[PDB]
Scaffold this active site. Structure first.
Site, PDB file in Angstrom:
ATOM      1  N   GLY A 150     -18.288 -25.460  -7.279  1.00  0.00           N
ATOM      2  CA  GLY A 150     -18.144 -24.020  -7.187  1.00  0.00           C
ATOM      3  C   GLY A 150     -18.759 -23.492  -5.892  1.00  0.00           C
ATOM      4  O   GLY A 150     -18.176 -22.651  -5.223  1.00  0.00           O
ATOM      5  N   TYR A 156     -25.063 -26.332   0.443  1.00  0.00           N
ATOM      6  CA  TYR A 156     -25.538 -27.691   0.250  1.00  0.00           C
ATOM      7  C   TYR A 156     -25.833 -28.383   1.578  1.00  0.00           C
ATOM      8  O   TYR A 156     -25.975 -29.609   1.606  1.00  0.00           O
ATOM      9  CB  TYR A 156     -24.468 -28.467  -0.516  1.00  0.00           C
ATOM     10  CG  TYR A 156     -24.253 -28.038  -1.956  1.00  0.00           C
ATOM     11  CD1 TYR A 156     -25.156 -28.387  -2.952  1.00  0.00           C
ATOM     12  CD2 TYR A 156     -23.120 -27.337  -2.333  1.00  0.00           C
ATOM     13  CE1 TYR A 156     -24.953 -28.023  -4.274  1.00  0.00           C
ATOM     14  CE2 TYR A 156     -22.899 -26.983  -3.653  1.00  0.00           C
ATOM     15  CZ  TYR A 156     -23.813 -27.324  -4.627  1.00  0.00           C
ATOM     16  OH  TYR A 156     -23.577 -26.956  -5.917  1.00  0.00           O
ATOM     17  N   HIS A 162     -29.390 -24.380  -1.854  1.00  0.00           N
ATOM     18  CA  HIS A 162     -29.441 -25.446  -2.839  1.00  0.00           C
ATOM     19  C   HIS A 162     -30.080 -26.712  -2.287  1.00  0.00           C
ATOM     20  O   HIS A 162     -30.596 -27.509  -3.068  1.00  0.00           O
ATOM     21  CB  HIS A 162     -28.045 -25.862  -3.302  1.00  0.00           C
ATOM     22  CG  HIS A 162     -27.405 -24.879  -4.200  1.00  0.00           C
ATOM     23  ND1 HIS A 162     -28.139 -24.095  -5.055  1.00  0.00           N
ATOM     24  CD2 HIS A 162     -26.125 -24.580  -4.404  1.00  0.00           C
ATOM     25  CE1 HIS A 162     -27.305 -23.324  -5.734  1.00  0.00           C
ATOM     26  NE2 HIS A 162     -26.078 -23.596  -5.341  1.00  0.00           N
TER      27      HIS A 162
HETATM   28  C1  FAD Z   1     -21.364 -26.166 -16.942  1.00  0.00           C
HETATM   29  C2  FAD Z   1     -21.016 -26.008 -15.485  1.00  0.00           C
HETATM   30  C3  FAD Z   1     -21.995 -26.153 -14.528  1.00  0.00           C
HETATM   31  C4  FAD Z   1     -21.704 -26.046 -13.155  1.00  0.00           C
HETATM   32  N1  FAD Z   1     -22.706 -26.303 -12.262  1.00  0.00           N
HETATM   33  C5  FAD Z   1     -22.399 -26.268 -10.990  1.00  0.00           C
HETATM   34  C6  FAD Z   1     -23.430 -26.593 -10.071  1.00  0.00           C
HETATM   35  O1  FAD Z   1     -24.545 -26.961 -10.395  1.00  0.00           O
HETATM   36  N2  FAD Z   1     -23.024 -26.559  -8.743  1.00  0.00           N
HETATM   37  C7  FAD Z   1     -21.760 -26.189  -8.266  1.00  0.00           C
HETATM   38  O2  FAD Z   1     -21.566 -26.153  -7.040  1.00  0.00           O
HETATM   39  N3  FAD Z   1     -20.784 -25.857  -9.177  1.00  0.00           N
HETATM   40  C8  FAD Z   1     -21.093 -25.913 -10.463  1.00  0.00           C
HETATM   41  N4  FAD Z   1     -20.118 -25.609 -11.399  1.00  0.00           N
HETATM   42  C9  FAD Z   1     -18.761 -25.286 -10.931  1.00  0.00           C
HETATM   43  C10 FAD Z   1     -17.779 -26.443 -10.991  1.00  0.00           C
HETATM   44  O3  FAD Z   1     -18.146 -27.549 -10.157  1.00  0.00           O
HETATM   45  C11 FAD Z   1     -16.385 -25.940 -10.601  1.00  0.00           C
HETATM   46  O4  FAD Z   1     -15.884 -25.058 -11.604  1.00  0.00           O
HETATM   47  C12 FAD Z   1     -15.334 -27.034 -10.442  1.00  0.00           C
HETATM   48  O5  FAD Z   1     -15.667 -27.978  -9.419  1.00  0.00           O
HETATM   49  C13 FAD Z   1     -14.001 -26.362 -10.172  1.00  0.00           C
HETATM   50  O6  FAD Z   1     -12.985 -27.369 -10.320  1.00  0.00           O
HETATM   51  P1  FAD Z   1     -11.834 -27.223 -11.400  1.00  0.00           P
HETATM   52  O7  FAD Z   1     -10.980 -28.411 -11.177  1.00  0.00           O
HETATM   53  O8  FAD Z   1     -12.371 -26.995 -12.766  1.00  0.00           O
HETATM   54  O9  FAD Z   1     -11.237 -25.860 -10.811  1.00  0.00           O
HETATM   55  P2  FAD Z   1     -10.024 -24.911 -11.246  1.00  0.00           P
HETATM   56  O10 FAD Z   1     -10.479 -23.501 -11.237  1.00  0.00           O
HETATM   57  O11 FAD Z   1      -9.463 -25.420 -12.525  1.00  0.00           O
HETATM   58  O12 FAD Z   1      -9.026 -25.193 -10.022  1.00  0.00           O
HETATM   59  C14 FAD Z   1      -9.241 -24.463  -8.757  1.00  0.00           C
HETATM   60  C15 FAD Z   1      -7.953 -23.872  -8.204  1.00  0.00           C
HETATM   61  O13 FAD Z   1      -6.998 -24.924  -7.908  1.00  0.00           O
HETATM   62  C16 FAD Z   1      -5.752 -24.546  -8.479  1.00  0.00           C
HETATM   63  N5  FAD Z   1      -4.930 -25.716  -8.750  1.00  0.00           N
HETATM   64  C17 FAD Z   1      -4.755 -26.440  -9.898  1.00  0.00           C
HETATM   65  N6  FAD Z   1      -3.891 -27.420  -9.771  1.00  0.00           N
HETATM   66  C18 FAD Z   1      -3.471 -27.323  -8.456  1.00  0.00           C
HETATM   67  C19 FAD Z   1      -2.560 -28.081  -7.698  1.00  0.00           C
HETATM   68  N7  FAD Z   1      -1.876 -29.124  -8.173  1.00  0.00           N
HETATM   69  N8  FAD Z   1      -2.371 -27.716  -6.404  1.00  0.00           N
HETATM   70  C20 FAD Z   1      -3.052 -26.665  -5.929  1.00  0.00           C
HETATM   71  N9  FAD Z   1      -3.935 -25.890  -6.548  1.00  0.00           N
HETATM   72  C21 FAD Z   1      -4.104 -26.278  -7.820  1.00  0.00           C
HETATM   73  C22 FAD Z   1      -6.131 -23.770  -9.728  1.00  0.00           C
HETATM   74  O14 FAD Z   1      -4.975 -23.125 -10.203  1.00  0.00           O
HETATM   75  C23 FAD Z   1      -7.214 -22.878  -9.119  1.00  0.00           C
HETATM   76  O15 FAD Z   1      -6.612 -21.805  -8.403  1.00  0.00           O
HETATM   77  C24 FAD Z   1     -20.393 -25.707 -12.758  1.00  0.00           C
HETATM   78  C25 FAD Z   1     -19.425 -25.478 -13.747  1.00  0.00           C
HETATM   79  C26 FAD Z   1     -19.706 -25.656 -15.087  1.00  0.00           C
HETATM   80  C27 FAD Z   1     -18.622 -25.429 -16.108  1.00  0.00           C
END
Ligand code: FAD
Ligand code: FAD
Ligand code: NAD
EC number: 1.6.5.2
Lengths: 274, 271
Positions: A150, A156, A162
């Site tokens: 995120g 980083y 961080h």
């Molecule tokens: C419990 C928890 C703790 C966390 N702690 C941290 C932390 O300590 N540090 C940190 O930095 N982050 C943290 N996060 C955030 C987390 O790392 C991010 O939510 C995650 O990396 C986002 O990836 P995703 O695949 O879920 O994203 P999504 O939101 O599912 O995908 C991102 C984007 O890509 C798009 N997409 C999907 N498929 C495709 C495709 N084929 N082509 C193009 N675009 C596409 C989606 O539609 C969206 O627009 C945390 C999250 C959670 C739930």
């Protein structure tokens, strides 16, 4: 590389995720170059991440004083491990390259993947105290982390709120992957994916795919060889005196974990060196 | 009357971890603390984040995102009740003790999951309020860790490398990120080869420590005021502060080493 096998371990619940997209990209790219590709989609498998007695289907050595490390090892050798564990173990044994695809959650791996490590990386199978680190069972194999965050890469950096990403990756890459013997390749870090525009997301996917075409020829990350240490209890597994004397007047340490109270080599856990 | 929450992550009541939990409870009650427990194995705590954590209507079920949806559910109060019950224990508590064995250089999966499901946005952190400005700045946390390996293996010259690096992601990235003052960790090395008479002294030592735990000085983390807390600046250290550190030999912390030497036992001893 035709004849070579890849395991892709995924820890994300959603098929709509960028993590799922990166998994699919990798599979596609690798198959095209003639890899066999096996998957462990942990959410889709409803993988059980909690260690317990139920991981041993046979007789416990000592059920009054249960110790998971000792009992799990016995079960591995006498072959009464829960079958879900064994199925994963077989995928690992077969595989030459292991890709871990997950989002960074609380500065580490998701609980479901952490549990996978705890139940699947059993003693004698994945490590012994005789064969740690570069001498470990998986020294033939290569592993890579592919991480989405995120937060943005600036957060980083050395000056980020961080702190250094190299420190965050160390416990995973050294303490889990290299400890079992894996050569660890440069991590694929995909920062602030939520706030990356669509045209860029597509380039990231294309870039992942391009990288995986020559992944096997990559140089791995540097960890201190085990041969720098006295591997026995009487010496305390300390760095040898000769090696300490040879490092005395160096400015940089060996790695993130072996900083030795000095400067950490730049991107020790992020970029390889020759 | 102050309140303490003890979070335990070990399956066995015969474990030294269980003994250390009981010791802490006893010591703390004797000094007139109220003591609440989360024995995660005994509770059969569910450590996996999923849609089922939200009992109400999803904002966007076609494109489910746990961070966004979990926050909405917190605010509109349709989080799974098991999450909420833990949240209430935290809110109430002044001191939080985490008792666990080191597993693969980190917390057990069940405890990691507790963090994932319980430390929701707006409740445990924002964006406005990170690190020392976070919601839990009134609270104090301590890790109490047992290892199989000996302390030599985790020294600067040990095969495993500096323990301070191992603790950084947990103490900084989880606990301090939400605002906790983090106290010196209780490290119990090579517990597997420690005989019963010694184990009892260790327990007595833990108990003695907990008598004055609240008056302890916490670990050093870089204050948030050293950084530009907005998206346009990238949350980087301020230019003035960078210029003032240029000439220093040591870095600020394990994570903020700045390419220089790490202060000795940054994550293990307070200044
Ligand atoms: C419990 C928890 C703790 C966390 N702690 C941290 C932390 O300590 N540090 C940190 O930095 N982050 C943290 N996060 C955030 C987390 O790392 C991010 O939510 C995650 O990396 C986002 O990836 P995703 O695949 O879920 O994203 P999504 O939101 O599912 O995908 C991102 C984007 O890509 C798009 N997409 C999907 N498929 C495709 C495709 N084929 N082509 C193009 N675009 C596409 C989606 O539609 C969206 O627009 C945390 C999250 C959670 C739930
Ligand atoms: C998945 C996994 C990964 C691991 N990874 C790591 C790793 O990365 N690094 C590492 O260093 N170690 C690692 N270990 C080892 C692990 O950290 C140790 O096994 C653990 O710390 C042992 O503590 P325990 O409480 O389980 O002790 P136990 O062995 O269960 O208890 C010790 C003894 O104390 C006795 N006892 C209990 N109460 C009392 C009392 N009141 N008085 C006297 N005696 C008492 C018990 O009966 C028992 O005989 C790992 C283990 C597992 C299972
Ligand atoms: N899972 C992991 O990643 C991991 C990593 C490291 C260690 N371990 C655990 O550590 C265990 C072994 O290490 P340990 O710390 O429990 O053993 P230990 O160092 O406590 O025991 C060493 C042996 O030598 C004796 N000894 C005591 N003091 C000594 C001295 N000064 N000089 C020489 N010998 C001395 C001890 O009585 C014992 O018999 C492993 O079997 C494993 O359970 C696990």
């Amino acid at each position: 590389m035709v004849g070579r096998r890849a395991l892709i371990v995924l820890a994300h619940s959603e098929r709509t995720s960028f993590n799922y997209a990166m998994k699919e990209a990798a599979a596609a790219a690798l198959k095209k170059k003639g890899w066999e590709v096996v998957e462990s989609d942990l959410y889709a498998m409803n993988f059980n991440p909690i260690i317990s007695r139920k991981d041993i289907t046979g007789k416990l050595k000592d059920p009054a004083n249960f110790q998971y490390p000792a009992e799990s090892v016995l079960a591995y050798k006498e072959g009464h491990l829960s079958p879900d564990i064994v199925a994963e173990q077989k995928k690992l044994e077969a595989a030459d390259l292991v890709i871990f695809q997950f989002p960074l959650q609380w500065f580490g791996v998701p609980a479901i993947l952490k549990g996978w490590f705890e139940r699947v990386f059993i003693g004698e199978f994945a490590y012994t105290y005789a064969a740690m680190y570069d001498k470990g069972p998986f020294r033939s194999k290569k592993a890579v982390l592919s991480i989405t965050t995120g937060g943005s890469g600036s957060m980083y950096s050395l000056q980020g709120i961080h702190g250094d990403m190299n420190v965050i990756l160390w416990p995973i890459q050294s303490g889990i992957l290299h400890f079992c013997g894996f050569q660890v390749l440069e991590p694929q870090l995909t920062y602030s994916i939520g706030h990356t525009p669509a045209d860029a997301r597509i380039q990231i996917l294309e870039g992942w795919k391009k990288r995986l075409e020559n992944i096997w020829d990559e140089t791995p990350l540097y960890f201190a060889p085990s041969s720098l240490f006295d591997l026995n209890f009487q010496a305390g597994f300390l760095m040898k005196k000769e090696v300490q004397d040879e490092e005395k007047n160096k400015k940089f340490g060996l790695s993130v974990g072996h900083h030795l109270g000095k400067s950490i080599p730049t991107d020790n856990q992020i970029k390889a060196r020759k």
